[PDB]
């Protein structure tokens, strides 16, 4: 299983088996919470971390299962 | 310039 990283610089699914047993999709808000919503910063992790204030972290363990609404197809 | 929840082309505006 591989995870993508929107919080590094570009975005790419790299295998994260050393430590992170899976992936994680995070969301929150950028410089100014635009009307478009938050962002989509997923990546790798050992377990869906952060879950007390408002951080909406998520998880995903599958062939690049961190695809967010990026290239709106159609 | 974000992989927001509705775009993937570093859109400025």
Swiss-Prot record, chain A:
Q: Which domain of life is it from?
A: Eukaryota
| Miscellaneous notes | Is identical to Alpha-bungarotoxin (A31) from B.candidus (AC Q7T3J2).
Tissue specificity remark: Expressed by the venom gland.
Give GO MF terms, alphabetically.
acetylcholine receptor inhibitor activity; ion channel regulator activity; toxin activity
Q: Which family does it belong to?
A: Belongs to the three-finger toxin family. Long-chain subfamily. Type II alpha-neurotoxin sub-subfamily.
Task: Report the record's disulfide bonds.
Answer: 3-23, 16-44, 29-33, 48-59, 60-65
Oligomeric state and interaction partners are given as: Monomer in solution, homodimer in crystal state.
- Function summary: Binds with high affinity to muscular (tested on Torpedo marmorata, Kd=0.4 nM) and neuronal (tested on chimeric alpha-7/CHRNA7, Kd=0.95 nM) nicotinic acetylcholine receptor (nAChR) and inhibits acetylcholine from binding to the receptor, thereby impairing neuromuscular and neuronal transmission. It also shows an activity on GABA(A) receptors. It antagonises GABA-activated currents with high potency when tested on primary hippocampal neurons.
Q: Name one GO cellular component term.
A: extracellular region
Q: Which UniProt keywords apply?
A: Acetylcholine receptor inhibiting toxin, Disulfide bond, Ion channel impairing toxin, Neurotoxin, Postsynaptic neurotoxin, Secreted, Signal, Toxin
Q: Where in the cell is it found?
A: Secreted
Any keyword Signal? yes
Name the major location. Answer: secreted
Identification of the protein by name: Alpha-bungarotoxin
Instruction: Tell me the part of the parent protein that is shown.
Output: 22 to 95 of 95
């Amino acid at each position: 299983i591989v995870c993508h990283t929107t919080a590094t610089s570009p975005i790419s699914a790299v295998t994260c088996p050393p430590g992170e047993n899976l992936c994680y999709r995070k969301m929150w808000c950028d410089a100014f919470c635009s009307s478009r919503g938050k962002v989509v910063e997923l990546g790798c992790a050992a377990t869906c971390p952060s879950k007390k204030p408002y951080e909406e972290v998520t998880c995903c363990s599958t062939d690049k299962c961190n695809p967010h609404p990026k290239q709106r197809p159609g | 310039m974000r992989y927001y929840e509705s775009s993937l082309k570093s859109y400025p505006d």
